Amino acid sequence: SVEHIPFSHTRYPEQEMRMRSQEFYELLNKRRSVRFISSEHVPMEVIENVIKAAGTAPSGAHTEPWTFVVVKDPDMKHKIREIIEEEEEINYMKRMGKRWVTDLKKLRTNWIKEYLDTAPVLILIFKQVHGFAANGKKKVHYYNEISVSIAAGLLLAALQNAGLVTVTTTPLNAGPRLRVLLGRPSHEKLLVLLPVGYPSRDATVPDLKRKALDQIMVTVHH
Amino acid sequence: SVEHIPFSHTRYPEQEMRMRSQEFYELLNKRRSVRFISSEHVPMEVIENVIKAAGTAPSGAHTEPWTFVVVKDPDMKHKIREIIEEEEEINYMKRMGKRWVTDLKKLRTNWIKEYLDTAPVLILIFKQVHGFAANGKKKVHYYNEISVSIAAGLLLAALQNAGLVTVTTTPLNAGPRLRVLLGRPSHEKLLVLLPVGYPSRDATVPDLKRKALDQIMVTVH
Numbered sequence: 001s002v003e004h005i006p007f008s009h010t011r012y013p014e015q016e017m018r019m020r021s022q023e024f025y026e027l028l029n030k031r032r033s034v035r036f037i038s039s040e041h042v043p044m045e046v047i048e049n050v051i052k053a054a055g056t057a058p059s060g061a062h063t064e065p066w067t068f069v070v071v072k073d074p075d076m077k078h079k080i081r082e083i084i085e086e087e088e089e090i091n092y093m094k095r096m097g098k099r100w101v102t103d104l105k106k107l108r109t110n111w112i113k114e115y116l117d118t119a120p121v122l123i124l125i126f127k128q129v130h131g132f133a134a135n136g137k138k139k140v141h142y143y144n145e146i147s148v149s150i151a152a153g154l155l156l157a158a159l160q161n162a163g164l165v166t167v168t169t170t171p172l173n174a175g176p177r178l179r180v181l182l183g184r185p186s187h188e189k190l191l192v193l194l195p196v197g198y199p200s201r202d203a204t205v206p207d208l209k210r211k212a213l214d215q216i217m218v219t220v221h222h
Numbered sequence: 223s224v225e226h227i228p229f230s231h232t233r234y235p236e237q238e239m240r241m242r243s244q245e246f247y248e249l250l251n252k253r254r255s256v257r258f259i260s261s262e263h264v265p266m267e268v269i270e271n272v273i274k275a276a277g278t279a280p281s282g283a284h285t286e287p288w289t290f291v292v293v294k295d296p297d298m299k300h301k302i303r304e305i306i307e308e309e310e311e312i313n314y315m316k317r318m319g320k321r322w323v324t325d326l327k328k329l330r331t332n333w334i335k336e337y338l339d340t341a342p343v344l345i346l347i348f349k350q351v352h353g354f355a356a357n358g359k360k361k362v363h364y365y366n367e368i369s370v371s372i373a374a375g376l377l378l379a380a381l382q383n384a385g386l387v388t389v390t391t392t393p394l395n396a397g398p399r400l401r402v403l404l405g406r407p408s409h410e411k412l413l414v415l416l417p418v419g420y421p422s423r424d425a426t427v428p429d430l431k432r433k434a435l436d437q438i439m440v441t442v443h
């Protein structure tokens with residue numbers, strides 16, 4: 001159907017591979033989810049580059065099932081805020097349940113989300129649960145959720161790389177209202193919302209620790 | 223429950239932010255899924271650094287619901303190969319269906335997977351659909367699949383950054399046999415399998431193109 005071509009690869013000497021892999025780990029390790037974000041301007045060129053980076057993700061059968069909806073308009077951001085705070089309040093009060101609520105205590109999150117106003121840019125990542133071809137026939141988006149999550153991962157990496165912060169959020173039950181507000185089609189579903197900017201001078205994060213290597217990696221012999 | 227501490231941030235001057243974001247895009251853009259992988263040795267230090275990088279992912283309510291199972295043993299890799307080829311053959315013949323099969327023609331994939339033997343290292347990413355606390359009580363892993371996929375994304379980025387290649391694979395219906403072979407617990411499920419190494423001198427990729435920016439980005443006023 002399409003042509004297959006020689007793959008062109010950039011290879012480093014081993015020592016540099018070692019250093020690169022270490023530095024990249026050290027860089028990503030400094031990524032923390034930040035819930036206090038400055039209103040300070042960020043260059044749209046950088047925002048575009050991080051979205052381009054996300055778009056380089058692999059996807060099931062090459063379907064690229066993602067839409068990155070960018071919101072900079074203050075009225076639109078605030079509209080987004082109110083929807084989310086409204087739904088999250090019901091979430092904390094009742095819909096998540098006691099266990100989940102208890103599970104969140106360590107993070108000190110609640111239903112008020114100031115960052116949705118203060119962050120200069122919001123990125124809403126929509127997955128396309130199926131697509132359409134040019135003739136208007138439906139196309140299957142194999143593993144679209146995983147594919148879009150991988151893209152989101154790349155996006156997260158690209159933000160850290162560029163010196164920006166965010167917090168990956170899942171505004172449970174806000175999806176349908178957000179879809180309508182933002183004029184997205186019925187086959188798109190909000191996956192995560194990323195408020196983007198610099199951290200506030202007064203930003204804090206929970207003193208969480210990541211697992212040791214021997215807690216996430218298992219090597220298997222015979 | 224735990225303490226909240228000042229967040230420490232590394233910030234660049236804007237111009238450098240621009241250049242960094244561009245270079246990182248250009249680096250990731252050169253990532254392609256590679257299905258022809260050399261048996262040449264790769265430093266385990268690098269493999270560990272890419273797994274460490276994956277492990278830095280955010281996760282729902284801080285649950286880190288992932289297990290990276292590393293396989294270098296040739297017997298064990300071959301065992302993995304046979305399970306997958308066996309299941310994939312049924313997949314192409316019958317289980318995926320005509321539409322999916324047609325959808326894969328452009329990639330020229332079939333049920334034979336030489337890379338599972340030739341790649342010096344296989345990484346099987348397992349999601350923990352729920353976890354256990356130290357007392358043995360069950361813990362909920364909120365959005366574990368998304369959380370693990372995001373980790374996989376970071377892993378993919380880390381591989382490209384270190385000059386390694388792979389192909390993200392989903393060996394449909396091979397999950398249960400693979401979990402048993404590899405001694406993983408019942409609450410772990412194989413998400414993707416990544417064969418890792420250098421590309422074969424003769425590696426090819428389909429001449430696919432990515433969407434234009436204006437095809438993935440929408441700005442809303």
Ligand SMILES: Cc1cc2nc3c(=O)[nH]c(=O)nc-3n(C[C@H](O)[C@H](O)[C@H](O)COP(=O)(O)O)c2cc1C
Pocket residue numbers: 056057058059060061062063142143146147150253254255256257329331389390391392393427430
């Ligand atoms: C969720 C997911 C599942 C995939 N499963 C397979 C697979 O089973 N076999 C395979 O050969 N490639 C698989 N791929 C790789 C895609 O076919 C590949 O990303 C796509 O063709 C675009 O190519 P690229 O990664 O070089 O940009 C998968 C990718 C994703 C995101």
Ligand SMILES: Cc1cc2nc3c(=O)[nH]c(=O)nc-3n(C[C@H](O)[C@H](O)[C@H](O)COP(=O)(O)O)c2cc1C
Pocket residue numbers: 031032033034107109167168169170171205208278279280281282283284285364365368369372
């Ligand atoms: C799928 C997913 C959903 C998340 N949803 C939220 C959310 O709705 N609200 C929030 O404040 N943080 C959310 N987070 C962020 C996590 O709480 C955070 O990643 C975790 O506490 C560990 O913190 P760290 O990112 O700084 O390592 C989410 C993370 C993931 C992976």
Ligand SMILES: N[C@@H](Cc1ccc(O)c(I)c1)C(=O)O
Pocket residue numbers: 059060061062142143310326329331332333391392393394
């Ligand atoms: N897992 C099979 C088929 C396959 C292949 C590529 C792809 O993007 C998808 I979604 C499925 C295989 O490995 O051939």
Ligand SMILES: N[C@@H](Cc1ccc(O)c(I)c1)C(=O)O
Pocket residue numbers: 088104107109110111169170171172281282283284364365
């Ligand atoms: N979405 C809610 C609750 C929440 C918060 C953090 C988190 O890791 C998870 I999973 C859920 C909120 O944003 O507060």
